[model samples]
Target chain A: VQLVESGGGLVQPGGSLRLSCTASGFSIDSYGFSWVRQAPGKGLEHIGYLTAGGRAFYASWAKSRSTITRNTNENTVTLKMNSLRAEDTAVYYCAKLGTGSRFAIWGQGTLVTVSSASTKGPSVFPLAPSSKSTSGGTAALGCLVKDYFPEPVTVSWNSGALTSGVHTFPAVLQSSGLYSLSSVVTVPSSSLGTQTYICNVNHKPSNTKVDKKVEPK
Target chain B: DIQMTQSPSSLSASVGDRVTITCRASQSVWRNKFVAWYQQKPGKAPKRLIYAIASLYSGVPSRFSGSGSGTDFTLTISSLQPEDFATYYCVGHYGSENDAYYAFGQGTKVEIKRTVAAPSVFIFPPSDEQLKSGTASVVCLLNNFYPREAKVSWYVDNALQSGNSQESVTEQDSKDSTYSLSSTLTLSKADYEKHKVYACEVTQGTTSVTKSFNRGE
Candidate 1:
């Protein structure tokens, strides 16, 4: 049999996480499913188990914050955890139970990274079109966001939402425990001559939104 | 290390049709005789149908059978039922007893040759967590499509991108038997700041769906 796991990429401490294991071949309601996890370089820990008949049993550490759910229509089992902590960072697996009290199959595993939180807001900088854009065709404007924490920020342009012609990069964690990101907006070279673009940054933790503007050269 | 290759990546069959799938190993599997067959329906785990070459797993239907030896093997269904419309995978075992490993075939899909659904495409901007770490990325999601295979491409400012994106394996939704897949594109800040307009295009059969993200739009 095969078990495939999905979800659980990255999350902040105190946030919630949902991991799923989809099973195939046999009827899901015919057997039990188990949730297991292992920290980086650590031993495995049994999180809990869910029976075909809806019975649930959980480990002491997970009983309060973790839940095991099954979607019969989807033939999938989900493990959801709330009030997460940094120590929760681990690789989670879903296992199939056999008649002899053994795990007959196991999922590939999903890695969960619970990052520490920060309260700092980003510093925004707007950059003019590059040299290549000055010649003609499409012009690109850049927005640089630096030193943000809690990893939840929104970036927009000219007080408008992002649409086609925009690319926002992932936030990079700095050695200083902060984060930085960049976004680019492109427009027709003809429109650059008359339009001024504003880069807007919204950071929820700091209750701040910053704006920076750039004009075509 | 043995490698397994399955032929006829996909096929069309109706109920009561006899179907057969083959798997060939890079080297002889006769030594270990450790070959197995598995069937997977969308949104479920794989179920083992045959193990140790030709032996049927307990509870498997008599209509499902396996045969062959050495480097070639086959799994045949005497009569395809409605529930038999799914994917099948063949696995071959190799390596020393102390370091055993399994190699899987790419998988073969059995489907009905009927009208297929078009994929719905959506673009997701990079998350704050991703941006703070200094990486800008975007995701293209293709959902609820039939027949599994879809071609995906990324573009910036109307120009095609060669290798900046990674596509996930197609996933089936058990409820509807439709498929979904996702592709992620990582942006280079230098290139992103010089151009505008990011687009994701998904082509399923003859139908194409494109979604774009424009900056300041």
Candidate 2:
């Protein structure tokens, strides 16, 4: 069985957030699901639980603000949290409950960032390959984004969507309350010989778009 | 975060053989039994088999068992079935509710002993009827391969083209149990008109196969 979690990203403080866990290879009506969360660098906290037959239970800390529901039609269990706060910035996970209240199956946790309105856009930096030699005939170019708030950003290559050979790291909360992250895109080394690659960064909150280009050497 | 290490990165065993994989954590995870084991097959999502140290997930076979506490743990298959030949991963949870996270083991692969077989590669170009509809595509098929690992690449006019490439899951043939996989690259009408040559390359181990289609032909 599999539980795939989605619907997490940036959420404004005091706004509502809904996270969903889609189940496959089994019936959602036959087991319970637990909603758990972990704040940055923190331990796991049980948020709520929903049984197959609709029985629900919430942790004392989340009882007033969270609701757990299941949709058998879609084989999905969702957690809705209202009136979020900065303290709620964390990675949330939906897990299938085994016997004795244990979490048996788990979703890849989704990061939810809760922040106030951000006025500053991110700074984008494009890095060229460190060496001329390519590994497996592919060279990687790096994009570093820093000093951004509100956590959501779209990264692209040459103004086009990147589907493969792209690795983007999780946004890190910096000491300045801004976020920082890096992404890398690998392309054929032959293309790099004559192509000027561009790293495009879009920050929706600040209505900012930045393009940094790396020229062929 | 606790560090996790798995032993015997890969092993060969026949059906009905008993197999054991071990995981060790950098720190104690005995408290709360925060350890889990999962099985993953090629191109499929992982399935949780054991949680809370030794408790089997619902519907998991009795032949699969887990044990240990503190810093060391083991997952044992009393008798391996044909489907049990896959990869196993272990995760250890640590920290407290205020600051918790998990570390995953590198993964242990359970393989079967078999003779190595090279893959036969074939390229199916878009039909004239499909090209007329402007929905052209090319497919590279690799059949009867052992070890289940292969890389497929596409080239347009001798230049590597990333394009819209997708690969199907490696599937085992029911007759010989050998693996087959296909990769598809969607071609635009403009590409069909402009490109003179298209190539599909399949590389498995030291063997590489390249099939090319020439527009002139």
Candidate 3:
């Protein structure tokens, strides 16, 4: 039910396709395995995927299915992935399905790196103080959290089921002994309906976390 | 606002060796502009090495540098001077946000390395004009550190000094200020002249920090 490492962090695409699962308590054979890509300053997107019965599916985002490969070792599974492209900037993450078509747990997604790799996220001090929003919108929502340790953090709007929106996540590491993260998630003015929008900071290690919220009307 | 405990906090220089000052964080700021840096010998405010996000304060020498960002930026004097000896300060603007409480790090009690002045000051006769033709004196000047009671030391060519000449530093509290500060370091040119290389190091409680210099490098 938890995540294990098999040299998990790598430069994706041509560099490597590797992830492993050791089913100690449950039979992962009955479950499906899929891979996702999380890019820097961005959220996760569906990439080429592998199903429970061992069938692989490629997203429009993936260039070539032939270029990517996956293999399983008994109860343990591995993805020998390769052919890295610029689009492969997202960190490759392998995920398993929970009961009732729901994802119960996920492997910690690593940042799929391109050319300029970052050991820690960057501190993005915005030059212009602009509201985060869609075109011609009144305001855009921005959230920033500084100096967090023991990763696994996410940012999103409190309102469920985002429709017609853009969200960007940026991380910064400075010589100054601290790490910083910020996000801009924007929804259309029409979607706002002149209602209030809430921003959330989801930190996993803190346990059953509630997002530090802010109102962006 | 970081409270400084200094009625006086700086040191004087002794060429052909290393010099420095040290400090620690009050509690722990975002590691951003947590410390205000200064290079003062007798009287002056200080030069800002970094402001908020490692954005260097305008008008600084390339030789006068800093590393480590946020709660841990280091003010480094790449080389020292006979005239470069001075007390340094690490002032930071840190405060509590939850309740809007004013806060600051314990002002670092800065002191020069008390090692005995070398019997002979090493003069690296400048091979070119870039290096002066005098008794090429190379000393380090360290300023700005938190946690007022800090231990400072000097070394040459990796070997420890034979004798230390400076007095142990002590601090006096200011009744009107949020923090207290004071410092002392004493060494003559005689002891410093004996070494080919030199360094100044400080230890705050358990954290050990060092800065070294060589004539060739």
Candidate 4:
């Protein structure tokens, strides 16, 4: 059996997005669906899954604004989200779970981008330093993206290599309907050094990119 | 992510026995992470026993408990019930913040110690005079094998026989579920005499026995 993903494109920040997965070559009711995603250059992330018994499981990061649903009548599984943000732009996939809790097959991913043709950048500046390390010798840093309208931002590290631990939380809906994205990076001991760990935040509203640099403590 | 490993591949015990299975993770899997346990039996599907490491799943017996954390964990059955003699497995996340696909520990099997009796075998061979009848039949009877469900097979000239050449079935003993199996082979006297070699085999798990009968003897 195969799964196909659709219903995604560009969306305004704080707008709504809907994605669907259609199944073929088997009864949709007989299998469960697991929704996964990957950012432009990021590794695969587990979004959530729907069980054959008609239940849903979402990552804590996505539990708030993400809804996973299934339509047996149409042999499709769907994901709906409100308050979309640039961080949500990624290729979404649906996987069928086999008998032993393994993914048997996967759907072709569909790209969803959050962008706006007009508008200026958000009011908030580069967030204060929220980087720290513990006795374990691993450094953790957070980049808080706030008040960004049309929430189009690209976040990356200047360490020259992507760390094994990189995560972006789902966008939070603020009082003004603007979105906030929190991205955290954990640098392993072997990868930490004096070189400034720079976090580049590109806000699309004003076509501005802010580079925030911090040193490991 | 953390890797899981289990100890004591298998153990023998009786009803009301106390048995413990341990699972260890390569990295820390402390309170922040979740662990799950399952039980699998022969001819039946596996069932979840505990989730979140220590919490028993709905309808699971209270006798089953999971304890310890941070790379060292244990699943103990306070009192092994008759139905609890099955394989057990443990799986868990590496850390609290990262709950991707969990790694599973190798399975641990709990077996009950019970005396098993071997099956008695009898073969009826046609006489020289009986072979003159043009047709002859040979019957193999396996009696009183402990542990219900034994498999029986017949071979003529070292060739396994089935369907038209043999018949086999298992039926329970009056006092207990232990069973007996029988197979009968019918052939033309010319073919039976020409084949010369006839064998009946019975097997039940690790216990197997065979008996052979030659032509006209």
The interface RMSD values of the models, given in order, are 13.0, 14.5, 27.5, 31.1
Runs with alpha carbons beyond 4 Å of true place in candidate 2: A1-17, A20-93, A96-217, B1-18, B30-34, B40-48, B55-59, B91-109, B129-135, B151-177, B194-197, B205-208, B214-217
In terms of lDDT, which candidate is strongest?
2
Question: What's the i-RMS for candidate 1 in angstroms?
Answer: 13.0
User: Per-residue lDDT for B109-198 in model 2, tens only?
Assistant: 786655678865555555454466664556555656786778899998898877466665343433355666656676777777788888
Scored by CA lDDT, what does every candidate get? Answer: 0.69, 0.71, 0.40, 0.62
DockQ of every candidate: 0.03, 0.04, 0.01, 0.01
- Report the C-alpha lDDT of model 3 over B1-217, residue by residue, as the tens digit: 2233332234433333444444454444443444445443422222234444234555655555544544455555555543344345454434333211112222223333332321111111112221222222222222223333555565666866544322222121121111111111123344344555555565566665564444444
Q: In order, what fnat does every candidate score?
A: 0.00, 0.02, 0.00, 0.00
Q: Write down the TM-score of model 1's second chain.
A: 0.66
Tens digit per residue, CA lDDT, model 1, B101-213: 34567788886543478865656555444455566666665655777788999998999988677655433443355566656677755566567788898887767777776
- Local accuracy of candidate 3 as per-residue lDDT tens digits, A1-217: 5644354443523565555655555565665555555453333344444455655555444535323334444465555556666565555555542211223345655543433332343221221112322236433444444444324456555655442232323344322333444444444556455555555555544443444344332
Which predicted model would earn the best TM-score?
2
Candidate with better TM-score, 1 vs 3: 1
Candidate 1, residues A43-121: lDDT per residue as tens digits? 3455777766766666557889998888889989899999988778777888752312223687878777687654788
Give each model a TM-score: 0.42, 0.49, 0.28, 0.39
Which pairs clash in the backbone of model 4? none
Ten-residue region with minimum lDDT total, candidate 2 chain A: A126-135
* Model 2 lDDT on a 0 to 1 scale: 0.71
